[PDB]
Amino acid sequence: FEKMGIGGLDKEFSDIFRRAFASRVFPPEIVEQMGCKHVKGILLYGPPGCGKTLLARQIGKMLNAREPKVVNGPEILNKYVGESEANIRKLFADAEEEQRRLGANSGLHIIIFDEIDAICKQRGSMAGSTGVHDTVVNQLLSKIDGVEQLNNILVIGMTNRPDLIDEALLRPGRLEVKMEIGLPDEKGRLQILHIHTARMRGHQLLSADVDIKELAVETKNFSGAELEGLVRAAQSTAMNRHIKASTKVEVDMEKAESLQVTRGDFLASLENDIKPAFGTNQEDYASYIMNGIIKWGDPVTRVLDDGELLVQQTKNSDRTPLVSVLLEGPPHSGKTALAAKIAEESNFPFIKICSPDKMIGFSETAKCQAMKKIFDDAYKSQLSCVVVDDIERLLDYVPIGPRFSNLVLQALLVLLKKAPPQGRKLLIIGTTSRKDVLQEMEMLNAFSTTIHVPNIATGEQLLEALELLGNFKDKERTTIAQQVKGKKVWIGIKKLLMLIEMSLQMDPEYRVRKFLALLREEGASP
Amino acid sequence: SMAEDADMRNELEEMQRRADQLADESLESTRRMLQLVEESK
Ligand SMILES: Nc1ncnc2c1ncn2[C@@H]1O[C@H](COP(=O)(O)OP(=O)(O)OP(=O)(O)O)[C@@H](O)[C@H]1O
Numbered sequence: 196f197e198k199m200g201i202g203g204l205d206k207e208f209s210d211i212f213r214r215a216f217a218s219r220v221f222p223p224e225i226v227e228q229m230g231c232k233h234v235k236g237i238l239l240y241g242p243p244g245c246g247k248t249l250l251a252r253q254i255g256k257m258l259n260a261r262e263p264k265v266v267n268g269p270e271i272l273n274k275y276v277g278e279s280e281a282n283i284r285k286l287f288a289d290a291e292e293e294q295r296r297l298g299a300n301s302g303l304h305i306i307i308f309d310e311i312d313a314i315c316k317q318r319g320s321m322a323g324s325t326g327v328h329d330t331v332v333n334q335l336l337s338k339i340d341g342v343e344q345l346n347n348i349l350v351i352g353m354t355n356r357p358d359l360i361d362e363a364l365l366r367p368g369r370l371e372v373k374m375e376i377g378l379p380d381e382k383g384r385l386q387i388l389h390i391h392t393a394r395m396r397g398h399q400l401l402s403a404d405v406d407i408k409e410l411a412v413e414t415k416n417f418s419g420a421e422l423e424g425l426v427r428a429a430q431s432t433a434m435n436r437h438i439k440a441s442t443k444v445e446v447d448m449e450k451a452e453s454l455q456v457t458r459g460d461f462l463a464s465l466e467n468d469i470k471p472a473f474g475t476n477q478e479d480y481a482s483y484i485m486n487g488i489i490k491w492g493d494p495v496t497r498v499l500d501d502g503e504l505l506v507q508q509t510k511n512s513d514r515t516p517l518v519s520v521l522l523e524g525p526p527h528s529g530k531t532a533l534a535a536k537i538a539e540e541s542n543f544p545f546i547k548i549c550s551p552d553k554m555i556g557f558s559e560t561a562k563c564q565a566m567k568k569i570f571d572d573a574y575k576s577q578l579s580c581v582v583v584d585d586i587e588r589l590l591d592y593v594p595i596g597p598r599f600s601n602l603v604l605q606a607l608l609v610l611l612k613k614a615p616p617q618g619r620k621l622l623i624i625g626t627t628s629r630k631d632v633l634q635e636m637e638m639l640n641a642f643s644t645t646i647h648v649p650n651i652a653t654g655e656q657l658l659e660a661l662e663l664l665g666n667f668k669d670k671e672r673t674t675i676a677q678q679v680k681g682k683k684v685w686i687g688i689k690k691l692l693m694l695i696e697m698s699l700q701m702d703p704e705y706r707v708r709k710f711l712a713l714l715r716e717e718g719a720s721p
Numbered sequence: 722s723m724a725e726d727a728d729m730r731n732e733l734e735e736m737q738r739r740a741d742q743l744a745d746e747s748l749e750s751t752r753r754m755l756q757l758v759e760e761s762k
């Protein structure tokens with residue numbers, strides 16, 4: 196299969212060849228002897244940018260057919276009445292005319308529909324509740340197979356929402372076959388890399404230190420389009436580095452010209468402007484964790500151990516492919532940082548974080564759609580780890596009333612039990628701050644376990660935290676230690692940070708008294 | 722909510738038939754008449 200542009204998918208081509216084109220290679224005499232008609236359509240569904248248009252083109256060019264006609268679904272729609280039907284009909288005039296002119300001796304045509312899910316939806320059944328775009332669906336249904344006969348056509352459809360297609364359009368009379376394309380495995384990624392680097396290998400623009408086999412693992416959940424972007428960005432960066440360095444000294448151009456084979460280029464493109472849409476993100480931790488982890492006490496070790504145990508349990512279990520855990524604690528205790536640290540230590544391929552910050556002013560329906568989209572994207576991998584943050588802020592809970600958005604709570608409750616398709620495991624970590632309220636709505640029974648994160652409990656722990664931070668000296672250290680010798684301390688780490696920052700703003704001599712007074716003013720008992 | 726029909730903008734009268742070569746031919750005859758009339762004198 197590698198002789199042509201596409202490569203990596205063979206189990207998804209044997210079936211498509213067999214159940215759709217067995218009659219297109221047998222000698223015509225036997226076909227007419229039996230008297231069976233050819234297939235009239237096929238359907239393909241998968242993630243975007245996974246090698247669909249190339250396969251659709253190749254399946255046409257391999258059949259000795261004419262030029263394909265590319266059509267985009269969104270462009271078909273128009274505001275004036277009676278134009279969408281004309282646009283749809285315009286794509287069949289040539290086939291009809293050729294068939295009429297040449298009888299039954301005509302060739303084969305092709306049509307490439309893209310995003311067909313936007314011009315086909317379940318038509319309303321109730322009177323007065325019909326869809327606003329039923330004319331297009333009616334026209335397409337009539338044209339595909341109507342009173343008049345067509346026997347020299349073949350329709351290919353593409354989409355990403357295989358659940359919104361009208362049922363009537365998928366019966367064995369129209370588009371009787373389907374196929375799916377998943378994320379290529381390591382072998383497929385290696386094959387794509389070698390196909391696209393065949394040019395460099397032939398023209399001697401590749402180094403011996405660049406090992407495609409090793410680099411394959413560095414791409415865990417990449418896509419073909421992303422691979423083409425990575426290669427092109429690496430070549431552009433190599434050219435830029437070449438011009439910059441070679442112009443530095445009056446050295447022969449040939450020496451620098453061959454220097455573009457460096458593995459530096461590829462690693463730089465890798466960590467440069469290549470941001471996968473189905474892979475771990477690295478620039479959000481800085482926001483969600485600003486100062487790392489400081490081991491001011493035992494509880495951190497226990498929490499990390501429990502996180503690792505949960506990760507191992509989900510990774511090495513077969514009867515429970517779904518695991519949930521709820522983090523709770525007093526306000527300003529630092530839950531999000533620990534959640535992010537656990538997620539990072541998970542070492543999973545796909546780690547997407549959902550937070551309320553990116554929904555300011557969104558309506559409830561928008562939030563539900565965003566949640567559904569995130570979960571749908573997380574389903575498409577062999578592993579995942581989602582992190583629901585706050586929760587109490589998604590619901591809009593307010594002590595007066597109480598008031599909250601019912602639909603978001605219902606969506607969360609329903610989604611915390613749906614299991615992914617066979618063989619694909621998933622993990623959900625949630626962080627809240629008011630466990631009693633969650634227990635009141637009868638949600639705490641949906642989760643599988645709870646973990647407790649306490650606050651600072653004793654003065655010596657505060658002394659250890661101050662020592663780790665390193666902002667006060669030994670004299671003031673001892674002064675504070677003797678002043679707060681008693682074990683009656685209760686303060687949050689983030690609050691401690693803000694208090695220290697404020698205290699630093701005072702005059703150098705008048706600082707200890709300020710900090711002590713501020714600490715005394717703040718709560719010192721549960 | 723379907724943009725209703727619109728009245729045909731209007732008519733822009735424009736008529737072109739077979740004048741070019743018909744009047745060029747008409748001319749080529751007058752020129753020859755002029756030449757002959759000049760020659761007689
Ligand atoms: N061992 C630690 N545990 C928790 N937080 C830590 C630790 N060491 C340092 N921090 C700091 O604690 C800060 C707490 O972060 P954050 O503001 O998200 O806390 P939170 O308690 O989850 O928030 P909120 O009070 O808004 O619910 C983090 O930015 C991190 O810099």
Ligand SMILES: Nc1ncnc2c1ncn2[C@@H]1O[C@H](COP(=O)(O)OP(=O)(O)O)[C@@H](O)[C@H]1O
Pocket residue numbers: 200201202203242243244245246247248249387418419420423
């Ligand atoms: N399996 C594959 N083999 C070859 N090229 C691929 C493959 N998968 C993706 N590509 C490349 O991805 C690029 C963009 O994909 P595109 O043609 O837009 O298809 P899609 O409809 O999946 O987005 C193309 O240049 C194509 O060469």
